[PDB]
């Protein structure tokens, strides 16, 4: 079938990435990076986080495989010495596949733009201070100010959410947790401080209230958006495929990274 | 139809429960206590408690309902002064069901024992300092030593878990969270430190590595238990049902009794 | 004595400053904004850390004193209808000084320069990750990587400090707090995670491991410097001086800022 | 001079208490557990703090001094290695001291008791909930409702005051730090949340509101106190006293036992 892969850039990194091509020359799979089923990364999250990217329009016909050529990551989880067994199960066919949730972050001006999320998105003001009323199903909530908030993905839970104080979720939930940046609380100003977890359907709105301008990250992307006047937030319809050989689960994936 | 109220024993209350049986009395409705369809509370969250423990063996066929004479709490959340147009919608039937998880605690000795919480169980020692090994899924994870976890419920999350910097999690979400209880990481004991949130199915088994007593809280309930060889946790497979006449969202009673 | 008044500059503030200016007018008082011995704030402590920072060359020698139309400010706290019996006492000689720490800020390139700070000062990146080694008098403590740092006075613990779960100190102790802005913690990245208070005459000093390019506050200040080769901070040898009328604990302070 | 020697009570502590005995018997030192002038401790931090209460009669003529068989104590920062040069410094005389500060408790009845803690006091409630009046200075502060409180020393601030999100704070400050042990914090419950350093001759007084029984701990004593009235806190006018014999800076100990 048709694969591609993509490398860190590294000496490590790309003569792994001949070896693997040289391997699936002695099979019958052909290299394309325009429309590929398997999308391969080495290096570490960060090159996957790329490759995702770089494929976010034909998420429903890829399987993405990971492969750390640094430390364990939590989507690169495949080691180096273990990449030519890797080529032989992934010719023979006889693989399954993990779908984990994504986020979507839909931004209005005044022409509507939509992203999507592997990890979190972010929500930080241009300079000034960060004020913005944070609405769920329509309701105002709270008039959070602070330094940002950040939705993430279940997977994304141990990225960037982890460090706010954020709760570490399973990738089979399709959820989406949002958490606080140094929030200000005393008598005037009061905010929730928990993270909030939320289900599919629910959707998270933030409304500026003076500055409408905001810079907000998209995983590695992050560009300053001018004259906003709403960012919504919701579990996406679409899916994210892994390729799986063998049995890694999430909770002995996060023993790994940041027990021993 | 077949129903009981229980009230927390205070003026307020205790004459509130006669008059809605007066009101029922002008209705199709039986009382009893034995075998009820309808279960109403009347005082606080403390008092729903009480409700939901004296009739956890027949939750499948109860429809519970909760008074709050005090503030609003998140079981109780309907005012006294809507007690009277509470009494006929109940009667007239014609009236949705929602369902909440539960958390099913197992303790095992060397006869076991089950329990079930509506909020949140909790592991405590018994005067000497506590460490347990953390084990998911038959995978040993952490070895845990501070004050004690906490185990919670969906609908838990916004009591005890949420004072120890867990999640506020939606109910609609089938799940459970841990949370830690003052832990210790220094160079030799290290922890996740960060809340954990499971599915359905994830079985989380605490084990002692020395002392084998636990003081073990389920709900307000709390026992010191000799002699532990291990307890487990997981969602159970009962859910406690509660009968909705209107539109309060979940997010919108923790607004009110959080914000303002 | 010479006197000179700041304002917010809004309707409240600008018309309070003008009548203070007239009932000094009836007084030897001498209005003087170039070698004042009283500044007077009104407004917002905003404002007052303004008043500190356009006279922060003659600290020795002015007593600040600060007046909020708006809320309770922890360094303006007179409420305006205060403001005629301070005109009065404040002419007649006969009033006490208290004194809080103050923080320095030196930055060395590649011409040093150095700043001063009444509430705090810290350090972010500008655009890539936050990386730099953490040194306590001369020696290695920590690989800080997340969002950034935050240095703060004792006064200043109220503000920034608090909201990134630093403790709050009383302003008697000479001393200066260290707190972390998300930062990274798993296998290969580990950080103190806990507040840091350091007394005198203690240097912490932060190095750039390869961004040399930081965005460094103080207080309301915020530039961009560039090719920074080390920023130090300790608690500096001036000390900024109040005029005191009456007891306003600053516990007091505390408790109508945060509890009521 | 006189010393004495303490020891954990293993095989390794006990034949190494016996070595430097024989090691003093070389030279002009009695051994005398009764007034001694020196005291040795031989295990980890809590056998010193069994050392420190052991003597906590007679502080301001004893220097301490820790040697540590497992890891490096804060306390006990000598390595087993070099007890045989600690043997013959230590008899030469010609060594300084150094002073850390100490937390006094006192206990109201209706005969009032105190008590002195070198790493901290807790206060918990025996079996109900914990609610307390916080007061500073005769102010009321706020109306507590958790797991409790802990009042720490200035070498305390690493140990069960950072479980609970304390500050890390020197000893050369003579000040006391209160954290929070799971504070509830609601519409109509409110505490500060943050961490709080009080001076010396600041007294904090805690009081009962409802139920007059409490745990209350010093170090690891920890006795049920009945019918108390008030419990004070405050910086002890006793310091306690150790012999230096190198340079082993507090900050350098910190970063051995949590960093590396
Ligand atoms: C660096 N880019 C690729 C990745 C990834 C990733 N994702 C991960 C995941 N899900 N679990 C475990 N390691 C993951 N890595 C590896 C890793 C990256 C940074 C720090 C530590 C590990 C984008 C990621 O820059 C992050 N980030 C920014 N500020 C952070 C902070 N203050 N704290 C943790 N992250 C922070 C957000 O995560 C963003 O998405
Ligand atoms: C008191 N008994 C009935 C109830 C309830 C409840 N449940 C709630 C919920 N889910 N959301 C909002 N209010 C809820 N209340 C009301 C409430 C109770 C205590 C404090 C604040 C509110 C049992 C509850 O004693 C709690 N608890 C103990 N130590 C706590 C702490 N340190 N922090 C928050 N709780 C704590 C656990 O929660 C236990 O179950
Ligand atoms: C706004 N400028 C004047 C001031 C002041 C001040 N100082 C105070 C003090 N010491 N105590 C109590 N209120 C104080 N105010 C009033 C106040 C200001 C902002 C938010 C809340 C209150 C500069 C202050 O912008 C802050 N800041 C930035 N990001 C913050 C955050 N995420 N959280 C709290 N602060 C934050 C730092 O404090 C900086 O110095
Ligand atoms: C065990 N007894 C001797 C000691 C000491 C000490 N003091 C230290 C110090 N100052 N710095 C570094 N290590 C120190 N140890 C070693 C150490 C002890 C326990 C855990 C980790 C280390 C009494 C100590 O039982 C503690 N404790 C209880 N519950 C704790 C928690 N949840 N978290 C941290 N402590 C906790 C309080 O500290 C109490 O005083």
Chains 1, 2, 3, 4 share one sequence.
């Not at 429903?60 to 495949?78: K, M, N, Q, R």
């Not at 986020?103 to 300079?127: D, I, P």
């Amino acid at each position: 079938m048709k694969y591609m892969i993509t490398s860190k850039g590294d000496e490590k990194s790309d003569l792994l990435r001949l070896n693997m091509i040289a391997g699936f020359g002695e099979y019958d799979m052909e290299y394309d990076d325009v429309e590929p089923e398997i999308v391969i990364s080495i290096g570490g999250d960060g090159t996957f986080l790329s490759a995702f990217h770089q494929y976010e329009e034909r998420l429903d016909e890829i399987a993405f495989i990971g492969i750390h050529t640094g430390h364990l990551g939590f989507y690169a989880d495949w080691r180096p010495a273990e990449a030519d067994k890797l080529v032989k199960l992934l010719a023979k066919g006889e693989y399954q596949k993990v779908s984990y949730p994504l986020l979507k972050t839909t931004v209005k001006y005044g022409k509507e733009a939509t992203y999507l999320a592997l990890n979190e998105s972010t929500v930080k003001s241009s300079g000034g201070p960060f004020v913005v009323d944070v609405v769920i199903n329509d309701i105002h909530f709270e008039r959070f100010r602070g330094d940002g908030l950040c939705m993430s993905t279940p997977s994304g839970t141990t990225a960037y959410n982890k460090s706010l104080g954020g709760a570490l979720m399973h990738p089979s939930i399709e959820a989406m947790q949002l958490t606080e940046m140094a929030s200000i609380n005393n008598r005037v100003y009061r905010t929730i401080g928990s993270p909030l977890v939320f289900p599919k359907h629910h959707v998270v709105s933030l409304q500026p209230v003076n500055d409408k301008d905001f810079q907000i990250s998209v995983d590695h992307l992050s560009i300053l958006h001018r004259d906003v006047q709403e960012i919504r937030y919701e579990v996406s319809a679409k899916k994210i495929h892994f390729a799986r050989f063998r049995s890694f689960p999430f909770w002995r994936r996060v023993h790994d990274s940041f027990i021993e």
